[PDB]
Amino acid sequence: KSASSLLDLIWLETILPKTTSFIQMKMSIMVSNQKGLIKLYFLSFLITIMISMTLFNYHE
Amino acid sequence: MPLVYMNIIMAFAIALAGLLMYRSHLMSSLLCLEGMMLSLFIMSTLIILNTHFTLANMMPIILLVFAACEAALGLSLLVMVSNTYGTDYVQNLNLLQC
Amino acid sequence: EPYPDDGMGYGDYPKLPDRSQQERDPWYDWDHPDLRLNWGEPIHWDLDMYIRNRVDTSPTPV
Amino acid sequence: MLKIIIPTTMLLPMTWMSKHNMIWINATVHSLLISLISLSLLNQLGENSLNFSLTFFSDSLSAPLLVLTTWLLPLMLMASQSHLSKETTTRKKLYITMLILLQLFLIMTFTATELILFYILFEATLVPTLIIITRWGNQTERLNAGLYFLFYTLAGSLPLLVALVYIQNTTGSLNFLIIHYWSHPLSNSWSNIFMWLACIMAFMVKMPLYGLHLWLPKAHVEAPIAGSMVLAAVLLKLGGYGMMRITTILNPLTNYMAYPFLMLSMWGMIMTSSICLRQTDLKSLIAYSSVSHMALVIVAIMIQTPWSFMGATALMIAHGLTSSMLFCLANTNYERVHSRTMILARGLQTLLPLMATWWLMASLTNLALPPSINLIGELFIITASFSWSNITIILMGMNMMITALYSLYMLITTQRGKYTHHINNIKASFTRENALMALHILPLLLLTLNPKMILGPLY
Amino acid sequence: KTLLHKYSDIPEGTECHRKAYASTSIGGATGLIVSAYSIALKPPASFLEGVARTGRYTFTSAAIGAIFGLTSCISAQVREKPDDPLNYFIGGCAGGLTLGARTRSYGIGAAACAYMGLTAALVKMGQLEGWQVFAEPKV
Amino acid sequence: MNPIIYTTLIMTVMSGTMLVMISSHWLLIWIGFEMNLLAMIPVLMKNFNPRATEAATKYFLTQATASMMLMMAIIINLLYSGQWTITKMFNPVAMTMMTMALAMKLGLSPFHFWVPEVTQGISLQAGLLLLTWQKLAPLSVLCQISQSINPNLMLTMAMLSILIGGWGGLNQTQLRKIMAYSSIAHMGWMTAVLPYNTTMTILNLLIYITMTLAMFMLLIHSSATTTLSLSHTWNKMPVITSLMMVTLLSMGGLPPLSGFMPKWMIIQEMTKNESIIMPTLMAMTALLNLYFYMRLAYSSSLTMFPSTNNMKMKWQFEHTKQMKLLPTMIVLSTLVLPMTPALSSLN
Amino acid sequence: LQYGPLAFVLGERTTRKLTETSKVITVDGNICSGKGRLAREIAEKLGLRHFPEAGIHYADSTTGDGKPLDVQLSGNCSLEKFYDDPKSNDGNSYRLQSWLYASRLLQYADALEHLLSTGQGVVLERSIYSDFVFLEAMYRQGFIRKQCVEHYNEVKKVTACEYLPPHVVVYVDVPVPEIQSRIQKKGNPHEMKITAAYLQDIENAYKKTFLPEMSEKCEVLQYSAREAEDAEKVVEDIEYLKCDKGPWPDQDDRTFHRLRMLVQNKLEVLNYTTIPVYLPEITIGAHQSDRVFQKFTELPGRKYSPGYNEDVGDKWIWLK
Amino acid sequence: IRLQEDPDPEDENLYEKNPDSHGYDKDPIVDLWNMRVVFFFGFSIVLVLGSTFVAYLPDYRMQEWARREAERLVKYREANGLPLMESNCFDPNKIQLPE
Amino acid sequence: RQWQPDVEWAEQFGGAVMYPTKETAHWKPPPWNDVDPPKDTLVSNLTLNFGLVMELSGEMV
Ligand SMILES: CCCCCCCCCCCCCCCCCC(=O)OC[C@H](COP(=O)(O)OCCN)OC(=O)CCCCCCCCCCCCCCCCC
Ligand SMILES: CCCCCCCCCCCCCCCCCC(=O)OC[C@H](COP(=O)(O)OCCN)OC(=O)CCCCCCCCCCCCCCCCC
Ligand SMILES: CCCCCCCCCCCCCCCCCC(=O)O[C@@H](COC(=O)CCCCCCCCCCCCCCC)COP(=O)(O)OC[C@H](O)CO
Numbered sequence A: 001k002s003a004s005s006l007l008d009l010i011w012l013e014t015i016l017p018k019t020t021s022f023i024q025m026k027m028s029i030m031v032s033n034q035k036g037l038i039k040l041y042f043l044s045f046l047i048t049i050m051i052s053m054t055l056f057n058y059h060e
Numbered sequence B: 001m002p003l004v005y006m007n008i009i010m011a012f013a014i015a016l017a018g019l020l021m022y023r024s025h026l027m028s029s030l031l032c033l034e035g036m037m038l039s040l041f042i043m044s045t046l047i048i049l050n051t052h053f054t055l056a057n058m059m060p061i062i063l064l065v066f067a068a069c070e071a072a073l074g075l076s077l078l079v080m081v082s083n084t085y086g087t088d089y090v091q092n093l094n095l096l097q098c
Numbered sequence C: 001e002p003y004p005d006d007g008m009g010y011g012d013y014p015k016l017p018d019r020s021q022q023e024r025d026p027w028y029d030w031d032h033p034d035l036r037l038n039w040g041e042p043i044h045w046d047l048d049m050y051i052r053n054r055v056d057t058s059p060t061p062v
Numbered sequence D: 001m002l003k004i005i006i007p008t009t010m011l012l013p014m015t016w017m018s019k020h021n022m023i024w025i026n027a028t029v030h031s032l033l034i035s036l037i038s039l040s041l042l043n044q045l046g047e048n049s050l051n052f053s054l055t056f057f058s059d060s061l062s063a064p065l066l067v068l069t070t071w072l073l074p075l076m077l078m079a080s081q082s083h084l085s086k087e088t089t090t091r092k093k094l095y096i097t098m099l100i101l102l103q104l105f106l107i108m109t110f111t112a113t114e115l116i117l118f119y120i121l122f123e124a125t126l127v128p129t130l131i132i133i134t135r136w137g138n139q140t141e142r143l144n145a146g147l148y149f150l151f152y153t154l155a156g157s158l159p160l161l162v163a164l165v166y167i168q169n170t171t172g173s174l175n176f177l178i179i180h181y182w183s184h185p186l187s188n189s190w191s192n193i194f195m196w197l198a199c200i201m202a203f204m205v206k207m208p209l210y211g212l213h214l215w216l217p218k219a220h221v222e223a224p225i226a227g228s229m230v231l232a233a234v235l236l237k238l239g240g241y242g243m244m245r246i247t248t249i250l251n252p253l254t255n256y257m258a259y260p261f262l263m264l265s266m267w268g269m270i271m272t273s274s275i276c277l278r279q280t281d282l283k284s285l286i287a288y289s290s291v292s293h294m295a296l297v298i299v300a301i302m303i304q305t306p307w308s309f310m311g312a313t314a315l316m317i318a319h320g321l322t323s324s325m326l327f328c329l330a331n332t333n334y335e336r337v338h339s340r341t342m343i344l345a346r347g348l349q350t351l352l353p354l355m356a357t358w359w360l361m362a363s364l365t366n367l368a369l370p371p372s373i374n375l376i377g378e379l380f381i382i383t384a385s386f387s388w389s390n391i392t393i394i395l396m397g398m399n400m401m402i403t404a405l406y407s408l409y410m411l412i413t414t415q416r417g418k419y420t421h422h423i424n425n426i427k428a429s430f431t432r433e434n435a436l437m438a439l440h441i442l443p444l445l446l447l448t449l450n451p452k453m454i455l456g457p458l459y
Numbered sequence E: 001k002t003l004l005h006k007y008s009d010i011p012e013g014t015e016c017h018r019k020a021y022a023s024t025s026i027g028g029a030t031g032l033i034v035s036a037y038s039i040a041l042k043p044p045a046s047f048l049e050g051v052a053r054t055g056r057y058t059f060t061s062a063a064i065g066a067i068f069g070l071t072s073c074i075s076a077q078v079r080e081k082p083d084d085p086l087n088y089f090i091g092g093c094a095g096g097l098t099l100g101a102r103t104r105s106y107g108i109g110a111a112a113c114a115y116m117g118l119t120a121a122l123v124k125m126g127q128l129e130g131w132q133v134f135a136e137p138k139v
Numbered sequence F: 001m002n003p004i005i006y007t008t009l010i011m012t013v014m015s016g017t018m019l020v021m022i023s024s025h026w027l028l029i030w031i032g033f034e035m036n037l038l039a040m041i042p043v044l045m046k047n048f049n050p051r052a053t054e055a056a057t058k059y060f061l062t063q064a065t066a067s068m069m070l071m072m073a074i075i076i077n078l079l080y081s082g083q084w085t086i087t088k089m090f091n092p093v094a095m096t097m098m099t100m101a102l103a104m105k106l107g108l109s110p111f112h113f114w115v116p117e118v119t120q121g122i123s124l125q126a127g128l129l130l131l132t133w134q135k136l137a138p139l140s141v142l143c144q145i146s147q148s149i150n151p152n153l154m155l156t157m158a159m160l161s162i163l164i165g166g167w168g169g170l171n172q173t174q175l176r177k178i179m180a181y182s183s184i185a186h187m188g189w190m191t192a193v194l195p196y197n198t199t200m201t202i203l204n205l206l207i208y209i210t211m212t213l214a215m216f217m218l219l220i221h222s223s224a225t226t227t228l229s230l231s232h233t234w235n236k237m238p239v240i241t242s243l244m245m246v247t248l249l250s251m252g253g254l255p256p257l258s259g260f261m262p263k264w265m266i267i268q269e270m271t272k273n274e275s276i277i278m279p280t281l282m283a284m285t286a287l288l289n290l291y292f293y294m295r296l297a298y299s300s301s302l303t304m305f306p307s308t309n310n311m312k313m314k315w316q317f318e319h320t321k322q323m324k325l326l327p328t329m330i331v332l333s334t335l336v337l338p339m340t341p342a343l344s345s346l347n
Numbered sequence G: 001l002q003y004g005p006l007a008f009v010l011g012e013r014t015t016r017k018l019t020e021t022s023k024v025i026t027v028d029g030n031i032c033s034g035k036g037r038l039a040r041e042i043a044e045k046l047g048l049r050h051f052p053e054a055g056i057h058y059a060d061s062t063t064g065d066g067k068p069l070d071v072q073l074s075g076n077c078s079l080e081k082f083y084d085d086p087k088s089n090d091g092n093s094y095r096l097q098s099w100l101y102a103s104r105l106l107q108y109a110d111a112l113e114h115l116l117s118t119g120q121g122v123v124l125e126r127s128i129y130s131d132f133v134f135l136e137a138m139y140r141q142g143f144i145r146k147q148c149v150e151h152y153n154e155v156k157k158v159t160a161c162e163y164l165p166p167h168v169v170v171y172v173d174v175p176v177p178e179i180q181s182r183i184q185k186k187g188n189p190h191e192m193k194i195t196a197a198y199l200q201d202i203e204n205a206y207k208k209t210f211l212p213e214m215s216e217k218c219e220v221l222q223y224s225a226r227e228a229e230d231a232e233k234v235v236e237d238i239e240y241l242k243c244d245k246g247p248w249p250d251q252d253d254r255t256f257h258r259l260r261m262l263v264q265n266k267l268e269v270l271n272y273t274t275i276p277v278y279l280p281e282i283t284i285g286a287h288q289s290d291r292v293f294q295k296f297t298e299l300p301g302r303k304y305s306p307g308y309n310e311d312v313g314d315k316w317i318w319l320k
Numbered sequence H: 001i002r003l004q005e006d007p008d009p010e011d012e013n014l015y016e017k018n019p020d021s022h023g024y025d026k027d028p029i030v031d032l033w034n035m036r037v038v039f040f041f042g043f044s045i046v047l048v049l050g051s052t053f054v055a056y057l058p059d060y061r062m063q064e065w066a067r068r069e070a071e072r073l074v075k076y077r078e079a080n081g082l083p084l085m086e087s088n089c090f091d092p093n094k095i096q097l098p099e
Numbered sequence I: 001r002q003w004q005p006d007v008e009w010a011e012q013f014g015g016a017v018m019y020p021t022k023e024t025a026h027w028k029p030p031p032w033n034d035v036d037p038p039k040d041t042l043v044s045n046l047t048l049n050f051g052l053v054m055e056l057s058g059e060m061v
């Protein structure tokens, strides 16, 4: 119940390896679901332009 | 930096914002694409004409001859999507979802 | 009846009574006489603990 | 080296252009011959490491591993040649190509003189192994197992690459000699703390350490036998070779930081051997057994005392030859019954008499009786660990008591019992199997006479 | 980096009200950035739904910063040790608890404490020893 | 497309990009970019399918404005400096405009959104030109002006490139889409050291181009576009799948394969500049690239996916394309690691 | 070279060599109606290269020596097995139709390549745009299931769209009772056991679904049994027809360059036939497929590339 | 049916064809040579001849030399009445301690 | 024999998204020939009124 199960095969596998897989996966579904509308793409360009020029103080 | 220079670059800035703020018409975006090269032409001309950079008068025309060349292909691109979709509406310009 | 759903991952495995293989009728025919086990009978989740040469739950007189 | 590396490389075109059926013959011929040549490096001079060229050098630690790897190469050939005899000539030739290439990297890695050159080939061993476990595996979980093995090793190795090049820019050259003679005190500081963690985690994952070890039960069990040996018999020690070399610079920060690793290995080795006390797959039984032995090597390195380093190499070599043996043993049954469950094939001494005897000495070597090299390694660590702390003998011996139960457990469950009634396909053991098993245990008991050769670089 | 200077200028273990309000601003500022992107790539419903999405994203980000700044500073006062990296860990991961509180998931809250606390501790090391992430080209 | 017209149109793109690397005038740099843009659109519209028009429209709409934005910082730099020479920019906001304009011509930051679909829509051969020849012209400008770019802006955009590129590849099916996300991840790799050292950016370029061009236009030899379609190729040409895995493993960068050439050299330079957190996270997310690299190799050669009975027909025939320069290109993209001192030659 | 881009650049036009005798006529009639006989006679009368209807081993005919290979090694489906057990779970029914349709793709590509490389006409028996009516007929009879229909339609949409229709199709109508009589005069035992229901199912969807829509892009001249025997007359009608439909009236060298480039690549013309759509009738598993391929590669002449198999006796193998 | 695959054929009894089968491959004659090569190129020359080479190697990591260097150092040191081995490792006279 | 991928293993990779969700639950995979299905053609022969009605294809009638 412990040792072989719980700690191993459940816990030690769900803390380091699988959680990193889940973290890499939850937003993988996101960053690969762009709706394909040109309006949304160029609107994200506006923000990326706006935040970089002055809001992040990237000029200086 | 005088006011006449400011009004042009600011016009470019608002032209840039409207270009990437696609409404439900590709022609309007193409029209708003038309803004900057004219703003670029105007902005370039005041700089070059003011500073008496005689040879640099090249570039204003050089700017226009090719910056209009995309408009040559862009309009045909617009009529191409309007020959299969029958509409310049950009909401249907998303067939490349997957 | 399956094991209690404590989240331990036991699944739908049957909760056979905690009774060692030592508590088997020796004279009854067994397909695995060294384990007193037949064929296809769903074996205990902890068979390798209640096996003949391990923990035995046979009733002591006292 | 050039005198071992070149013959190893030249086996590659030889096997490819060899005769249709003579591939197994010729490859076995010269791989044994190359191992004989590698016996020449077992000699070491007084204190200076045996140096041949700028890029290649050997010491009293690399050479005992070099002979082990080249001696292993014939063994995987014969063990795997049973089932591989039922596919295309190119497929079989591709396998022998891959073992030859895999061995080639191991020989060049162990004698690498530059730490960067060491890391390049140390991680390069992944590619030959990864394809072995995946392509020629005989299960379905191999697909997930290969990913687990590759990603665990790589996720730890990458910080090492960043850490290694940092030493190059700051200190200068990373030659294993110039590093030793120009050791500077790595003072305690948060940047040095992560410097210590990066240079150590890469080798810890490949040990594996308790917690960073779940790739082993998946990789080793699902891997083919030609692989199932090397992932347990040589390249785990490759992580060991990395530790004993990289810790030349990590002083005195190691003693302040070693505590989480020591407790994880020293306490986890009891838990890992407890898994072996209740297991269902024979391959998994030996796999978790390897973790317990390697965990004992993990703690052994970190005291950084003369006795610990000797017992480290002694157990490191002995376990590899041992754990390789048990995988051959599990292979023989797995071919006859076509399953890995322990209780399915109870009773083998009744049907196979000598197989029980080989199983007896195999389970005895893991039991580590005196004067077997396993015992001569574990005993040295116990004394070194006891000098470090008197309490650890409770944990150190507990495994020694626990390891007796499971090491004899498959002996009782498989051999010593009534033969299973329904099974009827057990055949008299082929003379290949018995000859292979003798090739494993005869050097081990012969090595008992002269432990000085394998005792390490501090004898 | 006016907001970044606003936070880092306040000495550790003092002016906790200023440190908290600076923490809210930094947490608030990143709230607008993520929400504005979310509205852009994913078109919401009518504007009231859009600001509802914007409000939620900003609220969590501000809340994570708010409690983190509070506990990261009072810990230095109470424990009388500002230099320790743990002084950021104990509050750095509590933001993960706050994220779990607004998302209603024990697993995601606990895992976020595992990660955010480590990163928050790492940030303290970065300021202490002299770590640089965007280092200028030196060689 | 009449072959004579097709050859001329590629030559113009050949000429347009070549003009950028040989120009010393800011206008002439913008001059070839517009010609290069003007010539690719017909090349992309090779099949005239509605998807191809979608890809061409997206590519034009994201590149023409970048050339327009390109001209904007040119005059502003002209306004504050008065010289068109390709040199350091003497006005900060112009170069802040410049880096974004050049990058979104390329796509590393959220600017990258056009790369995935546009690659998918166009043909496989057309996808090659966009992804192995269009990355030199913007990099040519960035190499020349690398002296004074803001390190904060460039590295952030490089981080986002490899982080977004690797993450999106995991959830992709069409081999064209994995190609775009793999390219996005690698472009951040090559441009991360761009402010620090320029030689190892060009190192990554030649290294990345060789493997990408080889494995793109080898995929053309397989005549497949989906993971399942690529999976079937083991039965027809198992050598192709075997070669597919070698470059795929090289694509990830596992030593001693030559795909580890850039990743190694990049970490060396960033470490030399005291930037050490930057490479480690940069190296970490490279595992995401390997995962879908490894997944594709799983379905290609490492296992055997089910085939189809009608595919027995293909065994009786053979390919007709002469795989121009293909065979040598795998060799120098998976085995050239021992030739590492060749870095000095690029300087 | 084999009409590469260099060839068309240097002057290898296609419309230059086309003459009015360049026709892609097909003779497609009912089952056992002697349409093959009429197709052969038309070829003899005109300058048309006759292409008899492709079978299971037509691919074998065009490859190697033309010797038919093992049925399992060359299709895995046999026509007579479908006759005896049309409802067998082995899927020999749909596999027979699907492989035959792929054989039709090769037949069309060979006809188009010869037509566009020599200018000679071609007469076909049951061209590409014919197999779909039997698939529908076999579907309604119940020999195959619905999922066979959608898959086959998927092949038709993906592949046949890339090709172009015939000039004027020749149709032969012979009544089903006479066809059921015509099967008996043959005497091949697998050919008697076929029911009149399937024969009827062939004919009704024929006149409802092949003649109507092909008529739009290619005229149809019906020839019943009495005029199916007539062959001198039928040539006159096809000569008195200008083919004002399809793309032939507006076909140029540019599209012909693309058409020959794709057709010459025999792999490409059926590259889209092996869609990863997995059907129980068509999906050969990994072990079975691998074993058959080993059988294929061990065969003579196929071990290496054509002209490079030293087993057959290709000399100079070290210098080619 | 779903899939068209041949099942697991069998586990070929290698002993059945040749009763003296050796367990290396199908073909007897090469298989007979297979022990003749693994035994000859194994036990004979890398195990027996291998052992004699390593066991009789020229002395490894000189000890009997170091054992030799003991007696004259101790004999010299004890005979003239000087402690047989000094506490300090390196000469301390030339050591310049800080301040 | 060693385990080999079956049809149920291929369906995992066969979808338009490797790891599907509620958003991708209806995303149809792209057509295999990459030619998306042509929708209804948008051509309108304006019935000209004269005075005789006229049905034109472009300019010519
Ligand atoms: C010492 C100085 C600083 C002191 C203060 C501490 C730092 C500031 C506060 C913490 C900032 C980092 C923590 C995350 C903040 C944003 C959280 C957020 O947006 O949560 C909402 C949402 C989570 O849920 P969601 O994924 O949308 O799924 C459910 C949908 N119904 O998530 C989203 O909608 C967005 C997607 C997930 C999050 C993406 C990453 C956001 C953070 C990026 C790094 C910010 C670093 C800031 C600090 C350093 C720079 C100043
Ligand atoms: C660095 C890490 C490792 C990187 C490489 C790893 C490679 C394998 C990785 C796994 C790949 C997936 C699993 C196996 C896939 C097999 C692919 C394949 O096509 O297999 C079947 C095929 C059949 O063989 P066939 O194509 O007919 O060619 C026979 C030789 N003419 O087989 C083949 O096509 C194979 C053909 C092999 C040809 C070998 C040629 C040898 C030449 C030797 C020259 C010797 C010169 C000696 C000179 C001496 C003096 C100096
Ligand atoms: C998968 C998660 C990680 C698994 C475990 C990996 C090992 C744990 C440690 C992680 C960090 C490894 C990277 C080490 C880089 C080289 C270390 C070294 O040589 O020490 C330097 C210290 O290294 C660092 O500063 C960086 C390492 C510390 C941790 C921060 C980055 C790593 C953690 C985040 C990325 C990895 C985690 C995964 C993310 C998805 C010394 O330089 P310095 O700081 O003194 O520089 C001079 C001056 O003082 C200022 O620079």
Ligand SMILES: Nc1nc2c(ncn2[C@@H]2O[C@H](COP(=O)(O)OP(=O)(O)OP(=O)(O)O)[C@@H](O)[C@H]2O)c(=O)[nH]1
Pocket (backbone or CB within 6 Å): G030, G031, G032, G033, G034, G035, G036, G037, G053, G079, G096, G097, G098, G100, G126, G130, G131, G132, G134
């Ligand atoms: N599945 C399938 N079977 C076909 C096709 N064309 C012909 N067959 C079969 O071919 C077999 C033999 O040819 P028949 O149909 O008897 O005759 P035919 O060649 O069409 O015409 P005749 O030459 O007049 O006899 C029959 O069993 C047909 O069903 C086709 O397109 N698909």
